[PDB]
């Protein structure tokens, strides 16, 4: 069996061809105070050809806007150390530590998509003084833990049995891990902005971090080895599909702060320039 | 055996291609990537009354 | 089993690659779809609302309002220019801050027309008209109301409807410009003028002013994805 | 099939050794329709006072020339009401109709080619530096292209092989262009239309155009032929638009 | 359901059989003057015989000829420094840095497309006299900011919060990380080349650099660690899709200088032989 | 949940491939399509243009116009010979850095017909007769033109035309040819000779000058991408 | 809308039964002078059993063949040197330095395809007697550089604008970057071997170096960092589609011994044996 | 359930293939590799008067 | 929405997919694997007059 | 926007994955087609096609063209035999070189029938008869034409025919055997024969020679793609 599907292209509007007029009818006359945009076109302002344009608007439609991966967080481990704390790397579930992917994500308010997630891990050896040995590939788990489940002590710990949580089991010098995550929010859609508080007597928590709750990921090395120390570095990759976006904002003038509000420092409306009149002349001999 | 076949992006002044779906879940399918529709009166004409745009807004 | 060969390309990280992946989570129920208003579609729809652009950008005004009004005046100031400005809808700095050049700097090309509003806000005793004007690229911008009157023009003539709108036509020899504008790809300029003056009756302010905004046409769209200058950090956490 | 005539608003030319007509890309200019327009106030079409043949000066065609240049718009500023109604609006939108004209007897040779190339953008004969507008254009007075590499500061690198653009002369013939042969045609005819990413555009701030005059044979003669030769250059606007009414812009 | 697509097949022209002749037609008198390239087949001039050609054009379409991954940029960060601006990289998104794929593009005045990006992150040890360490696998964060939104000045600024912003977290060891992107411009096309200036007295900004304004990218360590200090190189790669050019141009011939301008330095058209008549001979016992 | 078995080629980064991916902005609204003048869908169309070959790359004239003529003049010169070159659209320096051949180096194999257009620029008195010949692989290049006339040529006749073209038809054992041409795919030879010389009345310039455009016919195509050796960087920012 | 599309499947001939004879009729007598191959089956010799024979002939077609990815290029860069030549890398586009591809090609005299690229980055530290510290990820560019454009001389010449040129940014931990390539040849197919000269004297150039001319890679570093010096090497992977290929030949028997030539050391037909009735012997207690 | 189904790039001298689309933005769809348009004239011959090729170009 | 539905390989003694094409270039689309087409009579026959196979070869 | 999970897989390299990639030169325009002889479309034509097989592959003579013939000639020599080898056709010294040999050392699983084809090239004037004869596995290779009578064979009668086939019929009993054959998937054996003697003349040659040549039916099939072990190098720029 096959099944034929149907693509409609969508082009862009064609210019008709419009000659002298002297009327009663004002298209140019408008009046902003209703808050309504004037949809006037050259054809109504002076004399044009006709044109037939072929151009499509099909890189500003908000999938292909959306579906690139971008980097959201990247992490240090290493395989001996006196801390035992740093032997494994552990972080929450957001989008707003690199600035980059969360100012495309907050030109709207309510958001709701699937997500395909990569990872890219690399190691490098810690300088000492001795050096030469042979060492055996490296392997890397990575587990995801929602709310509520046990949290690893140690690189030992019983948790990392993952007979319930999903998890990655990973060897240096193959293709990069990826693995896609469906639509997981208890309401209707993502709130990327939240005016308001977590207690009903309207203080606590306020803002974005009232929301979320979507878990955490660890990783570690699973050789458990390495007489000379090595260090890792974990990287991930967000690429969001299957998209829909409410409620469009302007975009974010003021650089970011921190990953948990909206604080900012007064800035500028934009640069200066020497007056109202200012002009840059480039014809010249 | 379950396959789709549609029109690739091209110019303007063979052309389609074939599709399998290999797992249980839709979160796993490729994106969507060829659906432009449009409805900009929403955000640029938000009134109550219509305007015709060769009369005049008020009187 | 069935006889293979790889072909360059295995095993790469490509960033606007479009494949299938398997489902960490098997059989996941997801929350009903709900109908919330103001859905968008295409991110030209955002860029096609007027939005208020600030002309006055000189020193000293760059964090009040007055960055936003343009000032006229009564009496005989005929030889002085009201305003005039490039149009380079994504780099010039009277532009690129507005809802229309914030989209287009995620972006390499641009093609179509351009809207300009301009809204009087003086009293409703006052009269005047004025003359605003679009020079395509190839000369120096005009010096006098006499250059300028030979180009794309309009006479707005203020009263019961307060708005009057400026439509620049595209006009190119290619069919797309850079959002990085070069000498090679450049666009024009416009500028306003005094076409009669202003007159009040006794008991009003002398002093009035213009408010400018800008949008794009039904003919207009970008292409070229790109990430957008605006935006940095100097360490994650931010 | 050699005789021509073009007639626009109050103006005709007519040509008795002409070629053909060269129309750009098979587009012939028109009018801006209204599912492509972004601008919303009405615009005016003045149709007779700005769509008609101005000519330039003239330059003169000497045995070792390299070549000369114009610049679309702002050439034609100071032209007639086309120069005041570019004064005065903030948008406009026009094609072209180029016509270039030299003669001479049947005892001369030589070869000229006639281009028009979209978005020309230059260099400067310093690498770290940047380009300045007079070095770019002089209004109706043709820029020169040069013998050998130019140097000095603010001037443009102007190398006749490089056509000032970093590519080889001998393959503009990409563009939409003529050749005025001098046993063959004494005319060259290109049509123009309105070419641009965005559909109109300020026209004091934006060259939509490079007019190029560049002889690949020398010219030649013997004994007492004539030696002045001269070449002329003639321009008409077509389907002229504008928008954005203001005062006057003063450069 | 199911869908039937066709695809048509596109083939070279056939060769058609051809005789002696001796009439009026002169195919082969032309006149260049005009402006127009000659339609003359091989049939036009010599005797042929029928070929079916079954050759196609099928590679040399401008889908296929742009539709690959090129690299455009690449950078450096470190874990630890004295500087704290070495500890983070940031740049300002564009394709003139590396000279293979901006030729390329440059071929046309005017493209508009969709963009997939990848990223290929990898890490190393900083050269010191100690080494011997186990370091758990590193997590990097690249971060997109739009025109506008507020910059980073550290590695533990507020800003990373990423609440609009789209970022991407990645950790070593796993796939690269990659994302696409729709045609965002404020343009109806991209341009190559722009013959303008920015203010309107022709002066000001020449060229290019007036009309892309796309944003920036910042990439940073997660892990914040790592007494032995290691460093990380990022590089990016484009790759369109769903393309449309406009106006072809002729090819770059002097090499590039910089990544604003188009200036050049002056270069021949080829280079030498003996004389107009030069060939090599090849058939000597 | 679903079991599965993952393949080699698993997490590589193929720099060819054709994958489905995520967006990073959701339902954004690109800006609509405009008809723009000059579209180009296929590399072909730019090679069926004919550009200026640099027939005359001696020493001492690389970067002068002289480059593109080649001499002729009035007198006995019938032992002499105009021009001649080899046929190698990729690889020789006469036909590298046109158009077609800017075309053919991002490319490993082409296949077709290849047009040679000559055009006259002498006075109007000036007359005189040319013989342009193309010669097979697998002998020596002709000495005279007793020898060039043996293989495909055509005599070329000077008058109110001024143009004349020597089409190249492919001849060849294989499909495809190697742009970088070695001696196993070579493809022969082109040469011009004096058939009748040139004659002109008094009062003329003895010396005139023929010139040569280079193009592709209908039946070309070309296989094989690759990266070009004329562009190259010593380090970033360039 | 959706379009199903049928796929014949290819199978092998079935054997028919086939009993005594003794006729007039000799399958098995023929001639080889006249350049024929004779098309006898089993049934035409013996007495056979009728089969059907379900074996498919799909791994052996040239576009299964040929579709894999495999190295064509490795090379190595440096940050910090004292030379300025070895900060960036750079190379001729071919396909004749990796044996394995290059033989595989070479069964035929003509291709012609569109290709899909990857690249593979890595780095590592300097050997250096001081180590520790910590470096931000980072980022490569990769230029293409078509035959003609300008040439760059350092990591800081202006060169890498890539206004024209197609580029590829990338930044260590991401997905290997990739994007796809056209049949860019100004013949109408590859040509893997050519038995000519470049200039019409039959001499100059001999053989495959006078048709490729197909440009050139530049890849660099964007950092422009690491006071501690680093290395990176790149590898490049080539895989064609939509392939067609012509003419084919015997299979390389001797070694390569440069990118140039055919050029060649004699070699044995095949090793040797005791005897012409030499059989070793396997069935004994 | 939305499936194309188009033919594969072969030789001369089973054959078809299966997509989906799994992401709601069509910037996620894959590239249109099998659309071949051609239209030279617009470079080659842009001339007003049309020219035969076996009459004289002028006269 | 040009979907292409095609037939998978599998074995012999539900089985279609789905594709998609995203890209305006047919040099993006995935490769032809599912075209199986043969004519060896072009190097195993190549004679001018066709030989029986039952019969001499000569006289 | 749209809720995702990634799904193990992501960002790897897998070299023989088949995905779709963006294009680095958008709307570029292809060399049009052309029909060149010889096309091929599938790798089993070629291994259809007749080779010569070095049968005589003994120690000096590893580079002569006498390790392509076998030598037979007139007397008593019934006791003697005339060849005899192994079924190996990617294994064996024998056949590992010829055409169906190299193409399956690309593979790792094969199936079918083979063909052997047997030229007489002595004089017209002699005569004589032969027996080949082909055994299946199981046992030791036959010592006398007694026992090689027993299996699968055919009697050569010389004439105005020149040539004999020997056809080897798939006899196993696993579908497939491995191109790298053990004991386990071994094939058998081939052997000849003095069936009468070699008869000539007076003023003849006494000795001739027989050529041996070997192809594949049309049942014939590879899978399992691998690397050839053939070619290698030591370094690049090789």
């Not at chain 1, 292909?64 to 494994?88: I, P, Q, W």
């Not at chain 4, 240049?69 to 009401?81: C, E, I, Q, R, S």
């Not at chain 4, 040069?146 to 563009?175: P, R």
Request: a negative charge; proline letters at 6%; one cysteine or more.
């Amino acid at each position: 069996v096959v099944e034929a599907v149907e693509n409609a292209v969508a082009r862009v509007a064609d210019t008709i061809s419009s000659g002298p007029s002297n009327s009663q009818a004002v298209p140019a006359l408008t009046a902003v105070e209703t808050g309504h945009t004037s949809q006037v076109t050259p054809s109504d302002t002076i004399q044009t050809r006709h044109v037939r344009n072929y151009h499509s608007r099909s890189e500003s439609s908000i999938e292909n806007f959306l579906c690139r991966s971008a980097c959201v967080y990247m992490g240090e481990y290493h395989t001996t150390n006196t801390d035992t704390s740093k032997l494994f790397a552990s972080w929450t579930i957001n989008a707003r530590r690199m600035v980059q992917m969360r100012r495309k994500l907050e030109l709207f308010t309510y958001v709701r998509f699937d997500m395909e997630v990569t990872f890219v891990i690399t190691s490098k050896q810690d300088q000492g003084t001795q050096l030469g040995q042979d060492m055996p590939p490296l392997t890397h788990q990575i587990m995801y833990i929602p709310p509520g489940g046990p949290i690893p002590k140690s690189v030992t710990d019983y948790t990392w049995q993952t007979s319930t949580n999903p998890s990655i089991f990973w060897t240096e010098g193959n293709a990069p891990p990826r693995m896609s995550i469906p639509f997981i929010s208890i309401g209707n859609a993502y709130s990327n902005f939240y005016d308001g508080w977590s207690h009903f007597s309207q203080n606590g928590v306020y803002g974005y971090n009232t929301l979320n709750h979507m878990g955490q990921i660890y990783v570690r090395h699973v050789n458990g080895s390495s007489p000379l120390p090595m260090t890792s570095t974990v990287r991930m990759y967000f690429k969001p599909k299957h998209v829909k976006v409410w409620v469009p904002r302007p975009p974010r003038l003021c650089q970011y702060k921190n990953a948990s509000t909206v604080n900012f420092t007064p800035t500028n409306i934009t640069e200066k320039r020497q007056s109202i009149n200012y002009i840059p002349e480039t014809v010249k001999p | 055996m379950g396959a789709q076949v549609s029109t690739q992006k091209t110019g303007a002044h063979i052309i389609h291609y074939t599709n399998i779906n290999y797992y249980k879940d839709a979160a796993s399918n490729s994106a969507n990537r060829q659906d432009f529709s449009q409805d900009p009166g929403k955000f640029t004409e938000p009134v109550k009354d219509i305007m015709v745009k060769s009369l005049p807004a008020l009187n | 089993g069935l006889p293979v060969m790889n072909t360059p390309g295995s095993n790469q990280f490509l960033t606007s690659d479009d494949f299938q992946s398997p489902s960490a989570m098997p059989q996941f129920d997801v929350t009903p779809e709900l109908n919330i208003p103001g859905e968008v579609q295409n991110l030209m729809e955002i860029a096609e609302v007027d939005s208020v652009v600030p002309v006055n950008n000189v020193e000293g005004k760059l964090d009040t309002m007055e960055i936003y009004r343009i000032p006229v005046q009564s009496g005989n100031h005929q030889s002085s220019q009201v305003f005039g400005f490039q149009v380079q809808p994504g780099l010039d700095n009277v532009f690129k801050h507005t809802l229309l050049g914030e989209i287009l700097n995620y972006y390499a090309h641009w093609s179509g027309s351009i809207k300009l509003t301009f809204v009087f806000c003086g009293s409703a005793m006052a009269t005047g008209k004025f003359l605003l004007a679009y020079a395509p690229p190839g000369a120096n911008a005009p010096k006098s109301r006499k250059d300028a009157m030979l180009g794309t023009h309009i006479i707005w003539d203020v009263g019961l409807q307060s708005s009057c709108v400026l439509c620049i036509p595209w006009i190119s020899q290619t069919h797309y410009r850079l959002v990085q504008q070069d000498e090679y790809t450049s666009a024009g300029n416009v500028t306003c003028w005094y076409q009669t003056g202003i007159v009040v009756p006794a008991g009003t302010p002398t002093s009035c002013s213009i408010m400018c905004f800008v949008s794009a046409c039904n003919d207009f769209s970008v292409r070229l994805l790109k990430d957008t200058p605006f935006i940095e950090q100097s360490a994650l956490l931010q | 099939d050699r005789v021509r005539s073009i007639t626009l608003g109050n103006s005709t030319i007519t040509t008795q050794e002409s070629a053909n007509v060269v129309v750009a890309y098979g587009r012939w200019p028109e009018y801006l329709k209204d599912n492509e327009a972004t601008a919303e106030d009405q615009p005016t079409q003045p149709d007779v006072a700005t769509c008609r043949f101005y000519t330039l000066e003239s330059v003169t065609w000497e045995r070792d020339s390299p070549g000369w240049w114009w610049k679309f718009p702002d050439a034609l500023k100071d032209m007639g009401l086309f120069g005041q109604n570019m004064y005065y609006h903030y948008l406009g939108r026009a094609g072209y109709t180029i016509h270039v004209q030299c003669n001479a007897s049947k005892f001369h040779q030589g070869c000229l080619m006639v281009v028009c190339v979209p978005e020309a953008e230059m260099g400067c004969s310093q690498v770290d530096g940047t380009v300045n507008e007079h070095s770019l254009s002089e209004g109706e007075t043709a820029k020169k292209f040069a013998s050998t590499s130019t140097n000095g500061t603010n001037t443009v690198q102007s190398i006749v092989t490089n056509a000032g653009m970093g590519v080889g002369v001998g393959n503009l013939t990409i563009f939409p262009h003529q050749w005025i042969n001098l046993r063959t045609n004494n005319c060259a005819t290109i049509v123009m239309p309105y070419i641009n990413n965005v559909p109109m555009d300020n026209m004091f701030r934006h060259h939509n155009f490079t007019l190029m005059i560049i002889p690949f044979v020398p010219l030649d003669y013997s004994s007492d032929s004539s030696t002045y030769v001269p070449i002329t250059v003639t321009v008409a606007p077509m389907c002229a638009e504008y928008n954005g009414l203001r005062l006057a812009t003063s450069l």
